[PDB]
Amino acid sequence: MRSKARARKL
Amino acid sequence: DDAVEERVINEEYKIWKKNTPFLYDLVMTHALEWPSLTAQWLPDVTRPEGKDFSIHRLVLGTHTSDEQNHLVIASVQLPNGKIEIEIKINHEGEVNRARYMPQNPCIIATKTPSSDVLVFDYTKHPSKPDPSGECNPDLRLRGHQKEGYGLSWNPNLSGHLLSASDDHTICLWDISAGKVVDAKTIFTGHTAVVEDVSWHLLHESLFGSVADDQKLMIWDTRSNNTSKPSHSVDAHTAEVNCLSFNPYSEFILATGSADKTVALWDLRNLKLKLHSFESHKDEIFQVQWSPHNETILASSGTDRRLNVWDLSKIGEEQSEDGPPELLFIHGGHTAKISDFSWNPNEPWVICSVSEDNIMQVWQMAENIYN
């Protein structure tokens, strides 16, 4: 079961 | 020790960046506004008369931290080179996975962080998405209790869609007759999170699934028993995250695992793994056969590498620096690779997307495979 990272904006 | 690895990653990328003129015939890098968890080339190519490039298109998505998400169609110009977004459609939560329907490639299924599987006809949504952020899918497909990633359209029966979920189930819908469609069938054979599902490319009744229970299961839709598959294989020593059927060899498929290996399988004798491809230093999340070359497959995951394998080199002598069947290591990404797609119209071109917003469209040098 994968753990998504917290996404950063560019 | 944490931000030491940051130095390791920065120095390896410096060496990789310096070596691209000998290792690649093409490298295009593009920073997306938000990262995509998903990537799939659309089937069409346009070659405008008297221009030095061709135009290809990709299905992408967003993964935001607490901002409006979108399903995305991008265009890519490839030489005989810009990357541009053509449409953004409002989507509820991040796009876990997006896949186009072979029989009508305007139709895109998506996996959301809720249990709904959504279906969009992308030509029925405005050019600009509405600032309100409202999601208006063309269908909502009900059946799951949790999110998932696995999604597969049947190439031999239009409108038949499979989906895998963290609820331990696989759902089947027949979308052909913003309404809600309940699952035609729910397959309950796995005892843990189902990570991936894929239809066989030739046999309309046949599909495979892989799960955190470490199993590869082979299912037949003609069976009245939805709690037990036709075959059940102890595939790996950890979670199995992906599978892919070989498009030229109807008995052959590949699975990728948190055990850091890709396994090669023959459907006729699933007691005996044919080969184990070893070189990844972490969990594998995607595996894909080349559309053009029967002995070629690729794999990616958490170690930030995309490996290309050539099965015909299994057993060759050396003298080592890697096994003989490892054709190429793509080291252009500096974060986890979430998905990748082989371009169906330009042999050896791959698009790969990672967690740090990077999209790369690339092609290894010709002398490496020829």
From Swiss-Prot, chain A:
Localization: Nucleus; Cytoplasm
Residue ranges with Basic residues bias: 1-10
Tissue expression remark: Expressed in uterus and kidney. Expressed in both cardiomyocytes and interstitial cells.
Function: Binds DNA and functions as a transcriptional regulator. Displays histone methyltransferase activity and monomethylates 'Lys-9' of histone H3 (H3K9me1) in vitro. Probably catalyzes the monomethylation of free histone H3 in the cytoplasm which is then transported to the nucleus and incorporated into nucleosomes where SUV39H methyltransferases use it as a substrate to catalyze histone H3 'Lys-9' trimethylation. Likely to be one of the primary histone methyltransferases along with MECOM/PRDM3 that direct cytoplasmic H3K9me1 methylation.
Similarity comment: family membership: Belongs to the PRDM16 family.
Disease: Left ventricular non-compaction 8: A form of left ventricular non-compaction, a cardiomyopathy due to myocardial morphogenesis arrest and characterized by a hypertrophic left ventricle, a severely thickened 2-layered myocardium, numerous prominent trabeculations, deep intertrabecular recesses, and poor systolic function. Clinical manifestations are variable. Some affected individuals experience no symptoms at all, others develop heart failure. In some cases, left ventricular non-compaction is associated with other congenital heart anomalies. LVNC8 is an autosomal dominant condition.
Subunit annotation: Interacts with CEBPA, CEBPB and CEBPD; the interaction is direct. Interacts with PPARG and PPARA; controls brown adipocytes differentiation. Interacts with CTBP1 and CTBP2; represses the expression of WAT-specific genes. Interacts with PPARGC1A and PPARGC1B; interaction with PPARGC1A or PPARGC1B activates the transcription of BAT-specific gene. Interacts with HDAC1, SKI, SMAD2 and SMAD3; the interaction with SKI promotes the recruitment of SMAD3-HDAC1 complex on the promoter of TGF-beta target genes.
Name listed for the protein in its UniProt record: Histone-lysine N-methyltransferase PRDM16
Organism: Homo sapiens (Human)
Gene name as annotated: PRDM16
Stretch of the intact protein here: 1 to 10 of 1276
From Swiss-Prot, chain B:
Outcome (variant: Y149A): Loss of interaction with ZNF827 and loss of localization to telomeres
Any single GO CC term annotated in Swiss-Prot or TrEMBL for this entry: Sin3-type complex
Name of protein: Histone-binding protein RBBP4
Source organism (scientific name): Homo sapiens (Human)
Keywords noted in UniProt: Acetylation, Cell cycle, Chaperone, Chromatin regulator, Chromosome, DNA damage, DNA repair, DNA replication, Isopeptide bond, Nucleus, Phosphoprotein, Repeat, Repressor, Telomere, Transcription, Transcription regulation, Ubl conjugation, WD repeat
Family: Belongs to the WD repeat RBAP46/RBAP48/MSI1 family.
Effect noted on mutating V27A: Loss of interaction with ARMC12
Compartments reported by the entry: Nucleus; Chromosome, Telomere
Organism placement in taxonomy: Eukaryota, Metazoa, Chordata, Craniata, Vertebrata
InterPro entries found in the cross-reference section: G-protein_beta_WD-40_rep (IPR020472), Histone-bd_RBBP4-like_N (IPR022052), WD40/YVTN_repeat-like_dom_sf (IPR015943), WD40_repeat_CS (IPR019775), WD40_repeat_dom_sf (IPR036322), WD40_rpt (IPR001680), WD_repeat_RBAP46/RBAP48/MSI1 (IPR050459)
